[PDB]
Each structure stands twice: as structure tokens, then as C-alpha cells.
Amino acid sequence: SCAYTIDSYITLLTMSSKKRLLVEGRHDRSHLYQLIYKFNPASKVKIDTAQDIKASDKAMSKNNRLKIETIHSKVKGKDNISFLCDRAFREFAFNDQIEDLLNSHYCDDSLYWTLGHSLENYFFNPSIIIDAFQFLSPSEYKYKAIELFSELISSSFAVLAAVSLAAKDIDKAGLPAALIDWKDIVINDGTIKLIRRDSYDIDSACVDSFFNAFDAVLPRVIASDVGICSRVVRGHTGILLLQKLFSACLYYVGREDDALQADSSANYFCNLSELSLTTALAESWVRKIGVLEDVYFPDSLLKNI
Amino acid sequence: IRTISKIELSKIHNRYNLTVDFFNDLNVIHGKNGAGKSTLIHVIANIVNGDFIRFAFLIFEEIKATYSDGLKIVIRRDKIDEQSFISVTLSNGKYIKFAVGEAMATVREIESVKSMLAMDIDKFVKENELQKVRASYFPAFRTMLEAWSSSSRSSFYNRKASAFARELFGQFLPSINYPSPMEIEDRLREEIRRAQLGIAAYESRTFSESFVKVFSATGELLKEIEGLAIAQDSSIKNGYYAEYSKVYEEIRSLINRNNSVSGALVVYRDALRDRQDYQEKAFSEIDNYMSSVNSFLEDKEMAYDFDLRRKYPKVGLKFPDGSWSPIRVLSSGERQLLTMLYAASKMGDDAIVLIDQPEISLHIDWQEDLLKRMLSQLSGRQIIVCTHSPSIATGYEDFMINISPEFISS
Amino acid sequence: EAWSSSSRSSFYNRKASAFARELFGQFLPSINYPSPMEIEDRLREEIRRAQLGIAAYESRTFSESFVKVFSALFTGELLKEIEGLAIAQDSSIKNGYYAEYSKVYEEIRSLINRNNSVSGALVVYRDALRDRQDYQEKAFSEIDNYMSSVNSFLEDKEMAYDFDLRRKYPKVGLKFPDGSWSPIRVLSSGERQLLTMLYAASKMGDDA
Amino acid sequence: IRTISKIELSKIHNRYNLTVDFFNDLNVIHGKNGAGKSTLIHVIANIVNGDFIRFAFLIFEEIKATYSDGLKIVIRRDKIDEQSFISVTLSNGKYIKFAVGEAMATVREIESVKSMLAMDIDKFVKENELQKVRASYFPAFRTMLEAWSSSSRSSFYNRKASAFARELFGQFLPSINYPSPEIDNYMSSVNSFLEDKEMAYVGLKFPDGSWSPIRVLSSGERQLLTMLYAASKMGDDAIVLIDQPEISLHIDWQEDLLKRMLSQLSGRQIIVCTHSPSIATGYEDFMINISPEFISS
Numbered sequence A: 001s002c003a004y005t006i007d008s009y010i011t012l013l014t015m016s017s018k019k020r021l022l023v024e025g026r027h028d029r030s031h032l033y034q035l036i037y038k039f040n041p042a043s044k045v046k047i048d049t050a051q052d053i054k055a056s057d058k059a060m061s062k063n064n065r066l067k068i069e070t071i072h073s074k075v076k077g078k079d080n081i082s083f084l085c086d087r088a089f090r091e092f093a094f095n096d097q098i099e100d101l102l103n104s105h106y107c108d109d110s111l112y113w114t115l116g117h118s119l120e121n122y123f124f125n126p127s128i129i130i131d132a133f134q135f136l137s138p139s140e141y142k143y144k145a146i147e148l149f150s151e152l153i154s155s156s157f158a159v160l161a162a163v164s165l166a167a168k169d170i171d172k173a174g175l176p177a178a179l180i181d182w183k184d185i186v187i188n189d190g191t192i193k194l195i196r197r198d199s200y201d202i203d204s205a206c207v208d209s210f211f212n213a214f215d216a217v218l219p220r221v222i223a224s225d226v227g228i229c230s231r232v233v234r235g236h237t238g239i240l241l242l243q244k245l246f247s248a249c250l251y252y253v254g255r256e257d258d259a260l261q262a263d264s265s266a267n268y269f270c271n272l273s274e275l276s277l278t279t280a281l282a283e284s285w286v287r288k289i290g291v292l293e294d295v296y297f298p299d300s301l302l303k304n305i
Numbered sequence B: 001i002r003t004i005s006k007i008e009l010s011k012i013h014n015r016y017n018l019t020v021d022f023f024n025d026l027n028v029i030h031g032k033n034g035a036g037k038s039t040l041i042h043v044i045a046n047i048v049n050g051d052f053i054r055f056a057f058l059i060f061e062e063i064k065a066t067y068s069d070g071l072k073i074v075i076r077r078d079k080i081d082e083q084s085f086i087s088v089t090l091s092n093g094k095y096i097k098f099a100v101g102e103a104m105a106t107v108r109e110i111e112s113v114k115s116m117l118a119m120d121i122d123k124f125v126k127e128n129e130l131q132k133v134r135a136s137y138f139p140a141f142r143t144m145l146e147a148w149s150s151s152s153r154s155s156f157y158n159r160k161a162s163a164f165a166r167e168l169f170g171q172f173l174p175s176i177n178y179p180s181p182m183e184i185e186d187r188l189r190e191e192i193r194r195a196q197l198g199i200a201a202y203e204s205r206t207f208s209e210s211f212v213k214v215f216s217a218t219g220e221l222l223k224e225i226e227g228l229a230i231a232q233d234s235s236i237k238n239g240y241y242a243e244y245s246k247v248y249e250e251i252r253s254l255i256n257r258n259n260s261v262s263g264a265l266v267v268y269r270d271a272l273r274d275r276q277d278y279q280e281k282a283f284s285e286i287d288n289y290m291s292s293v294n295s296f297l298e299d300k301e302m303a304y305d306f307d308l309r310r311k312y313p314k315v316g317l318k319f320p321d322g323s324w325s326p327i328r329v330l331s332s333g334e335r336q337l338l339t340m341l342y343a344a345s346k347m348g349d350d351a352i353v354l355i356d357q358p359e360i361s362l363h364i365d366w367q368e369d370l371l372k373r374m375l376s377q378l379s380g381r382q383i384i385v386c387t388h389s390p391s392i393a394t395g396y397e398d399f400m401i402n403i404s405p406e407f408i409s410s
Numbered sequence C: 001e002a003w004s005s006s007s008r009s010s011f012y013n014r015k016a017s018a019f020a021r022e023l024f025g026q027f028l029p030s031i032n033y034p035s036p037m038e039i040e041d042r043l044r045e046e047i048r049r050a051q052l053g054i055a056a057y058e059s060r061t062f063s064e065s066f067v068k069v070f071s072a073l074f075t076g077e078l079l080k081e082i083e084g085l086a087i088a089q090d091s092s093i094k095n096g097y098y099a100e101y102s103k104v105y106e107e108i109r110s111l112i113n114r115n116n117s118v119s120g121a122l123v124v125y126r127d128a129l130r131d132r133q134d135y136q137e138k139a140f141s142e143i144d145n146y147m148s149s150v151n152s153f154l155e156d157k158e159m160a161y162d163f164d165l166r167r168k169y170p171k172v173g174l175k176f177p178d179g180s181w182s183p184i185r186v187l188s189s190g191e192r193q194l195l196t197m198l199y200a201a202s203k204m205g206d207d208a
Numbered sequence D: 001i002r003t004i005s006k007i008e009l010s011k012i013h014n015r016y017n018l019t020v021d022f023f024n025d026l027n028v029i030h031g032k033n034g035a036g037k038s039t040l041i042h043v044i045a046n047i048v049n050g051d052f053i054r055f056a057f058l059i060f061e062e063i064k065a066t067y068s069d070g071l072k073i074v075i076r077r078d079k080i081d082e083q084s085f086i087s088v089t090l091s092n093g094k095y096i097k098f099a100v101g102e103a104m105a106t107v108r109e110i111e112s113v114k115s116m117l118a119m120d121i122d123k124f125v126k127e128n129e130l131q132k133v134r135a136s137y138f139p140a141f142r143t144m145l146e147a148w149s150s151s152s153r154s155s156f157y158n159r160k161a162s163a164f165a166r167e168l169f170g171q172f173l174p175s176i177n178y179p180s181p182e183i184d185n186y187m188s189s190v191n192s193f194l195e196d197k198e199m200a201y202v203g204l205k206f207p208d209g210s211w212s213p214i215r216v217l218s219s220g221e222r223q224l225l226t227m228l229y230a231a232s233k234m235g236d237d238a239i240v241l242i243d244q245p246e247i248s249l250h251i252d253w254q255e256d257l258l259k260r261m262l263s264q265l266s267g268r269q270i271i272v273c274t275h276s277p278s279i280a281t282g283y284e285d286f287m288i289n290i291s292p293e294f295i296s297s
């Protein structure tokens, strides 16, 4: 491909006099560009992505964080460049209850970590999820679906965190994305219970191990604080899980008026692209900054650059 | 409009096959050395410009071009009884066929005057409306080409430069249709004249229309009138009449020294605001282009200068020390940026911007901002760029297309 | 000029002077007489300068008329005279970029007719129209005088200028009574001689 | 060998000044366009070749050039009452001063065998030892330049080519001494970047058996061949001056190319002005910034 290597990018840092920022993915670049352009639409900050830097090593080829650590180590002490990575499950304690050992943005010589599991964990504020789902909806029974979702969202975060922890225990992070479907979800009095469906395309051993891990991890997540709980959910897992949970609640609360219309709306919402959901959440997250005190953003990173 | 969407090549130079589908907005092409990106650019230029007589200088089998609106053009090279023929067949069933040797005879007649084959090709592309959209071809050697033109070229007259380029790089090379910086300067002077004449017409219209606002007919308006008068007097566009502050001071003194007067004041404020908006509207494209250009220049700014006595406006570089310099004092990269930003400007004609290696003699900071400034003008053109620099193609990774030539064993 | 039209100006005439000195000996002076292309270019430049001067006069008269109106603010024959002036303004070739004087006059007349202080506005409106008409005659005086001198000779055509708001380029060339337009190169030899010999004695030409 | 160690630039068209101290072998140059990187390359390739008459065409006030051996060449342009002068002063006491109008008269004599002032310049570079080492100049537009004589030059005879280049880009353009189409090391050095065939020991070695000549190659391949031929000791004893070596080059082939150039161990000074950061991967110590200082005028 046509991209810089680690050494070529380091030489570019020597040649360029711009203020630069290095992030993991392109989605982080687009979201941070919107965030920067909100405060300063004429800002001249250039945001680079470690995803678009070629690596000779096969293992280092798709490890964006290792690229960032290598580049940061070799230019350690520069003033004009900042680095951003994803915290993942680092600095989190799983001693029967979810504990955040940092509770703030990490900073180590222009290297920063997201407060949550990834950048998308900033979207997990309830107002942002509401605004985004309301804006991207079939516009048939949106108000009642949003009201029900707003009721479910308080306890659903424990379920989402339990799903993410069950995924990371067996190292199958992408397993709930294709295993769990919105029809399996049941809407209770503020909670949900993903019944173990008898029929699955994947082998029963993986399904059984996933539900055993989920059952063994759910009470530990329940006893934890809600605010800490909303940050450990995996970003990619969380986007799809919220899309299905909203498709399920929409069909659950809209079937009495018209079962066929509710099923069509639920299938339409479930078939929505991940990029559309992430972009809508990012725009809503940008809009809620400064209006609500409960919306966070990498203030230290923006201040530093 | 009509934009290209799909290109299907078969056996180009009897060695490689290529099939690339294109976007209607941006096409960033990247690849290895000798992939055939320059050959693809020349093929696309000869397809879009309607200059099919260049295809006798290309070794191919079948070339299919599919546009966005459904126009499909099939160009087939055949060899019957040792005589080579080119057959171009459209999607509507219309086709033409001509000899390669007749095309070479026409080329030699031009080299050593319009012939019958060129007029027949022009009639064929006229009756089929095949030349609706042009194509701006930017060679990688265009800095030397423009240096050759300025040391001795227009879009309508570029025969010597096209002949020189076809002598240097083969007769398959299309006509040189990218604008020269001298052409940019002349176009800027013409657009300045057009803006001045539109300002003159609006001035006559406002002189006539102000009396119907007067016949139809407080401290904040005096401040707004003073600010508008200071802004108009301190403006480049009002270099022929910048005496509004004296008018404001006399108006304020005549109010202070001793209903419908407030109506006259507010319609005068409305007239001055409308005049200022029309001046901004007339110069919006040129001011936007100069704002795009001056974002890269450090110690100078490309600006237009009027004179009350000299009626010929001056176009060139203004320094912070007050010096005025022409556009020829610019370096190679600044000239390249000027031509590329005028290519993406709305002032240029509707064409397909074909650039091979846009990053020639450009600083790495300017390469990261070139496409941002090009796409901010919202010209709506279809841009095809072949580049080897990732700093050119940053932020538009969804439109990056890789060329994989399919080698055929003989 | 037939030899020149198969391969010039009053300042760049080196090739033609060299050829004429080759034919007639080296004592022959430089060929300084203006070509009709130079005359056409000079006419376009003078028209553009006249338009810019008209725009500056419009701005100055607008500001001065507003000041005099607002300061002096705190009949039947005047409307007819202003009507005639607006009709004369509308019926001129020079107003090709703006021909909406009669509509503004009708709006002012309709506002007046449904119901002193208005007499001063009427007379300064008449004075503004007269001043604009006089500046239009003054700014186009040399061009109209030269074209009136030329068109006294031509029989079936007339040299004239044209403006159009859709374009932004004043058209200069020959106008036929059937409405067709042709450039100045379709003149014969004698008519071209008349054109050059009358431009050389005009005020638009150089002091010579 | 004689290599240039310091170029003093003062009042360069009375607007910017530069002062760059050079390394012995590798001098990578980065900077903005219009700062004078190609101007610095042309200044060095005119001074090292001894073409002092080019500075009559160049607007400056004073330029001091000090080589690695300590020899100083101070070239100063004055204005002696409408007749400007070019005063080249050395540290050995021998200095040459000639009028700029005299230089233009000499150029017009050549245009319409050298003239008096060209022989004066040759005499000054002959009696003062100012051209121990030549300068194989590589223009940034060298593909079209070797295309210019393709449809119609050698490493020694380029007077038509340099005159045409001075016509197109100003008379300050130096003599184009770069080659146009140790030895086995150069063959294997080319063979690293070769794709469809290989070059070793006059003919190519295709796997299909073609003994193709030198000039059938593509543009980038010929650029690599021209940039690598002077990298060897097979080329002349010259300070190899290359303007933008990444022209018509992939971003991936620029990495080991300077390794192959420095594999020859030639010992001649190599100065490159590049904007591509893939040129100097691992060559950051030789990277020199150009920062022209604007002066009031």
C-alpha cells in the first residue's frame, strides 16, 4: 500500500513543523477532528492514525498500540506530537467487583489513554444514546421506544459489561456479535435476560462456555457501581449490543399496534451499519459537551495540543 | 453532469489487463512502479476528450468505459489483413471505424492543416455529443513545461506545446489542457473586469433604486453607519470611491445641529449593506481562491491592486514590507499549488482533473493541506489523482484505489 | 495590410517596417499608422474606462443626493419632465446593463399620485437624472463623436458598441439594419482606410 | 578530496540570508519551497565547477564559500555607478573583479571558442586551484531532460543541454554532468531493485533470454540507474549533487537506495534536498534544515 513506515513517519516528524496527534484508528481520527473543530473550526492540528502506518513485522502489522509505543519510545521528549491509545481492560480490577484504578485520563509524555475501554465508551452517556437512537429511528413509535429504552438503560449496562467480560475471559471478543441476536433478548422491568437459544450455527461447546462465563460473571457486575460499570464495555461489542437491545425494545413495545410494522422497523434497525451508529453517537457526544456536566472528553489532550 | 464510473481494459500493450471502477468525486490511485497508472491517465484523457485518433498509437484489444449516466463506450483495436483498424462503438449503437495508417498519415500531414479524418471524427463526436465534459491532464513534468512556455500557451491555442510534448513523450500523449499560471493571471484579470462591470451595473441599479426607498419614507444606526463607512473606505474594491466617512460625519453633524428621517436612515443603511453584500458576492470566488492560496504563503500574499489613475488592475504578490511582485517570482511548488488550486476552483471550466504525481516539488506540509483546500471549494468536478505520497491521500482513504495489472503469458 | 494579414500595432511594427524597408530602401520610416485591430482594442479599453467612470459618478451622485435630500427634507410639469428624462435614459445603448428606469419612475409616480417637501425631492431627482445623462454624454463623447464621423461614410452598415448583462464583455463591431453583427475585419479596403484615417485625427489617438 | 564545508548566503536578491555548515559525505536537506534548496544546489554546482560567470546573472551582494580544506572563496556583487561588478576574492590574495555588463557582452558574443572573460574565468580557475573536484549535477527534472535529447548529450558534452536548461530555468543553471544511458558491486547494487530481470556481467539478462540494451527501461528504472551509476567510483571525481532523488520514485524503493549508494564507499560529498521522508530513513543525522532569514528592504 501507499503509506509511511515507522522510520518514514519519524523522519516526517523531523521534517514537519506542525502540531500532530497519533491515534489508533481512523474512526478516532474522525471523532477527534469533529471534537477539535467544535472548539476551533479553523484549527490547524493534523491527526495521524497508527492504522495507516506500515509495519515490516507480521505481529506488529496489525498492532496499532505497538506502533504507537515504538514511535513514542524513539521520539520520547518531543513537544509537537501527542499519542492516543485505547486503555482496553488495563488498570481494571476484577476482584469480584469492577474497580477503576485510574478514574482519570492517563498521561505519560504525550501518550494518553481513554478513560473507558475505548473511545466509544464516551458515547455510553444515556443522553447521547437517547439523542442518537431518536435521531436514527424508523419514526413510527420512537417516543415510546425511547422511553422504554431510557428505563432499561440503567440496568442494561450490567448486562453489557457481563457480556464483554465473558467475551474477554474466553478471549472471543467478537463472539457475542454474531452469536446473540435481538430476538433472543427479552424486555423485563428494566432488565434483560438473553435466553440460551437451543439452535445456533456455531458449535454448542462455544455457546455453552459463553453462557457459563456470562452466568458466572453477571452477579459480580451487579454488585459494582453503575458509573464504573459503563466504562468497561467493549466498544465494538457495545455498539452492536445497543443496536440489538434497541431493536428488541422497539419491537417489544410496538408489536401491539402492528406486529408486521414493528418487525419491519426492528429488522431495519438491526440491519443498520456500525459506521452510521458510531458517527451518530460521535455527533451527539460532540453536541452534548458543555450542556451536560456528565459528558466527558479528553480535555487534557486538547489542552496539551 | 456526466462522470466516469467504470473502466475495463483488455491487453494494454499486450502485456497487462486492468479493470478499475471509479468514483464521481475523487479517485486516488496508488501503486508500484510501471503499473500503468500514467497509461491509464492517458487512456482516460483520450476517452473523455473524444480524441480517439490517439488510440492508433496504443496497443490494446478492447477498452470499455462506463459513465455514471449509463453511457458505455467500447473501443476495439483489430488487425484485419495486416491492416490495423480502430473501432469505437457507443452504448446507443452508434459506431465509427478508421484506419491506423490513415490516422498516422493525418498526423504526418499535421506535422508536415485540418484533414478529412479529423473533420470526420469531429462530426462523429458532434452528432453523438461525446465531448460534453473535458479532462484536465496534469503531467508530472508540467513545471518544466510551464517553464518552457514562459521562457520563449492558452487552452484554445496550445499547438506548439502539444507538438513539443508529443515529440518528447510519444504521439499517444493527449492535448495539453491544464491551465498555465500566465493563463491563471489572465483569467484573474478577466474575472476582475467581470466583477468590476457587475459592480458598475449594481451601482447604476442602486442609484436608480435608492430614490424609491427615499420616497417610501437611532444611536445604534449611527455606529453601524460609521463602521460600514470605515470598512468601505478601507477596502480594496472601493479604490475608485472611498469617501463615505465624510458623508457619515456630515450626516451626523446635520442630525445633531437641529419619522421619515429615520426611514431615510434605515433605507440608506439597507442600501449600504446591500452594496457591501453585492461586493462580497461578486468577489467571493476570487477571495476564496486567494484565501486558499495565502494559507500556504508565508512571507507574501497574492493580492489584486487597483489604481484610481491606472485603470489596469495589478495582480501579484504583496509583501509585508510593501513590495509588489508578479507571479513569476514564485517558486516551482508555489506555482504547482496555484495551478492545482485553480484546477479545483469554480473559475475553471468543467473538466476531469487528471493529475499524475501532484506532490512534485511540494513541501510535506502543503501536501497534507492541498486536497483539503481543493475539496473545500465545492467545485463538483471529478478528480483522478495518481500519487505515491501518502501525505497527499490522507483523510480520503475510502477513495484510494490500488492498480493490480494482470500479466498475460505469450 | 494584405501582406500583414497573411502571416502589428503603432508600437510593435518591427516586421512590417523591416519588410517595407527591404522593398523600398532603408530610408523609409517606421510604419506607425494604427491597424484597425489596434483601433478596436483601444475602443474597448475606452468603453471600459467610461463604464468605470460612470460607476464612480453613480456612487458620488448617490451619496451627494442622499445628503442633500436628507438635509433639505427637514409639480405636474416636473413629473412629465422626469418621465421624458427616464424615457430618454431607457432608450440609450449605453444603459444596456440597466434598463429599469421607467419602472422606478412609475413606482415613484404611483406613490406620489395617491396623496411642499416632495417638490424638493422631485427637483433634485430631476437634477440627478440630468447629471447622470450629462455624465453619460461626457464619458462617451469621444467614442460617439468618432463613430458618428465614421458612420457618416458607411452606407449599409454602422459601427456601434453593445453591452449585455448576461455576458460581461462590451461588444464592439459592425451593426447591420437587419440586426446582424460582424467584426471590423469584414470591411473593404477603402472603408478600412476611412476607419484608420479618421481614428488618426481623433482625440482617442496619440498626440502626433 | 576538496568538498564544500560552508556556504554563506547574504542579501540573496536582497531578501533572505542563509548559512549552512556541511558534512563531509552526506548532506540531506529539508526545507520549504522557495527557501532556496535548489538555489543552494545551483550555487554549489556553479562554484565547485568554477562557473563564476553565473553569479553575474544572480542577484546578491556577498557570498562566502569555504571548503573542507579551509580555502575560502568570497564572491561579492556590488554596483559601481550603474555598472555592477562581480568580485570573487580568495584567501590566497588573488581576486578577480569583472563587470556584469562585460559578462552579458561575453554571453552575447558566445550566442551570436570562448571570449575574453570566459578565458579569464578559466585562467582564474587554472592558476588558483579551485577545481580539484568537479560537481556531477543532477537536475530535479532530469527525466524530461534526458527525454529532450531522446527524440533529437554525454556526461562531458552537455553545452547544448545546459544551454537549453539555462534557457528554460535561468542562466544560473550549471553544467549537466550527470550520466545518461566496483563495477560488479554496482551490478549487484542495481540487482537489488530489479524486478523482471537482473543486470550483471553489454547486455541484460532476462529470464526469457533477452539481451536488451540499456535504454529500453522505464522512467523510474532509468532514474535509479542514473542515480546509482554516479554513486559508484565508475563516475568522475565529482561532488555528486542530486536535486530531489525521489522524483518518479516509489515510497518503498527510497530506503535501501542510499544504502546502495553508500555501499560504494566513494568518499565524494553527496548533497540531497528532499521532501519525501522515506529518502532519509536512518539518515536523520545528515538532515540539514534550511531556514532563510528575511531581511528588511
Ligand SMILES: Nc1ncnc2c1ncn2[C@@H]1O[C@H](COP(=O)(O)OP(=O)(O)OP(=O)(O)O)[C@@H](O)[C@H]1O
Pocket (backbone or CB within 6 Å): B013, B031, B032, B033, B034, B035, B036, B037, B038, B039, B040, D217, D218, D219, D220, D221, D248, D249, D250
Ligand atoms: N510502448 C509502451 N509505451 C509505454 N509504456 C510501455 C510500453 N510497452 C511497455 N510499457 C510499460 O508500461 C508501463 C507504463 O509506465 P508508466 O509510466 O504508466 O508507469 P507507472 O505505473 O505510472 O509508474 P512509474 O512511472 O513509477 O514506473 C511501464 O511498465 C512500461 O515499461
Ligand SMILES: Nc1ncnc2c1ncn2[C@@H]1O[C@H](COP(=O)(O)OP(=O)(O)OP(=O)(O)O)[C@@H](O)[C@H]1O
Pocket (backbone or CB within 6 Å): B328, B329, B330, B331, B332, B333, B334, B361, B362, D013, D031, D032, D033, D034, D035, D036, D037, D038, D039, D040, D059
Ligand atoms: N532573481 C530573483 N529575484 C528574486 N527572487 C528570485 C529570483 N530567482 C528566484 N527567486 C525566488 O527565490 C526563491 C528561491 O528558492 P528555491 O525555489 O530555490 O527554493 P527550494 O526550496 O529549492 O524550492 P523548490 O522546490 O520550489 O525549487 C523562489 O521563491 C524563487 O521564485
